[PDB]
Ligand binder design. Structure first.
Ligand SMILES: Cc1onc(-c2ccccc2)c1C(=O)N[C@H](C(=O)O)[C@@H]1N[C@@H](C(=O)O)C(C)(C)S1
Ligand SMILES: [Zn+2]
Ligand SMILES: [Zn+2]
Length: 241
């Protein structure tokens, strides 16, 4: 088993599949986890989501690489055997967007914040094929998110990056904070190299307010947590200003 240097460990409830780990969170929601082996440091886990919506599946975030992302698609084919309608990626960094080419080879429509698509080439990423735009209060413009089923996309403001977005899963008590939110026991806010240290706290809190009844908070580098992950992230971010 994979014991990452950074990221949650495997526990009861986890399925190893290839180089990845999958965990069912709800009857129709699974967390995908993939690992980047960094030289001299060991594996860094990154999480995203798989959502069944009737006869189709929706994905939030790629794995770190194209091969890992193809493995996600193979797990979905094995375990669910329904087509992937679209994927939403939550900002233009490798943990979230490093597998875009596997999605595109598979014929899956991809969506990202317009700003993530504008940044991606500068980051050595491939842009998603469609751009999401957002209102002044952070809610996605619904015409840019056609047929998203239960995915409710919200741009909370700059934080981990200027383009980070978040996704609520309607019909469940789950919301996904991506790299913006760290868990309730975290000692750090992770990589702040692209962060907006003035606005981070307010953006973390805005994500909480967008999904006020979400009780299970999913994030990129820890196991799903309570709402304390939001409040503790904001308290850590208050110290950056
Ligand atoms: C590693 C890693 O190695 N190379 C890239 C990369 C490639 C192209 C563009 C940008 C980065 C990368 C990456 O994606 N790093 C992310 C980042 O910087 O935010 C990861 N999220 C952090 C967080 O959530 O705090 C983290 C400390 C877990 S690291
Ligand atoms: Zn990032
Ligand atoms: Zn990250």
């Amino acid at each position: 088993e994979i014991r990452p240097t950074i990221g949650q460990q495997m526990e009861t409830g986890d399925q190893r599949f290839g180089d990845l780990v999958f965990r069912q969170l709800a009857p129709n929601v699974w967390q995908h986890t993939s690992y980047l082996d960094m030289p001299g440091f060991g594996a860094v886990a990154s999480n995203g989501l798989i959502v069944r919506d009737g006869g189709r599946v929706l994905v939030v975030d790629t794995a770190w690489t194209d091969d890992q992302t193809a493995q996600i698609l193979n797990w979905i084919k094995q375990e669910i055997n329904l087509p992937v309608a679209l994927a939403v990626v939550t900002h233009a960094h490798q943990d979230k967007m490093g597998g875009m080419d596997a999605l595109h080879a598979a014929g899956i429509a991809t969506y990202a914040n317009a700003l993530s698509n504008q940044l991606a080439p500068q980051e050595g990423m491939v842009a998603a094929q469609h751009s999401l735009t957002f209102a002044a209060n952070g809610w996605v413009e619904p015409a840019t998110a056609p047929n998203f089923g239960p995915l409710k996309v919200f741009y909370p403001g700059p934080g981990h990056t200027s383009d980070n977005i978040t996704v609520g899963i309607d019909g469940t008590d789950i919301a996904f904070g991506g790299c913006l939110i760290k868990d309730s026991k975290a000692k750090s806010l992770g990589n702040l190299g692209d962060a907006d240290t003035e606005h981070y706290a307010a953006s973390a809190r805005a994500f909480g307010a967008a999904f006020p009844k979400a009780s299970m908070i999913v994030m990129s580098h820890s196991a799903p947590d309570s709402r304390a992950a939001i409040t503790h992230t904001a308290r850590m971010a208050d110290k950056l200003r």
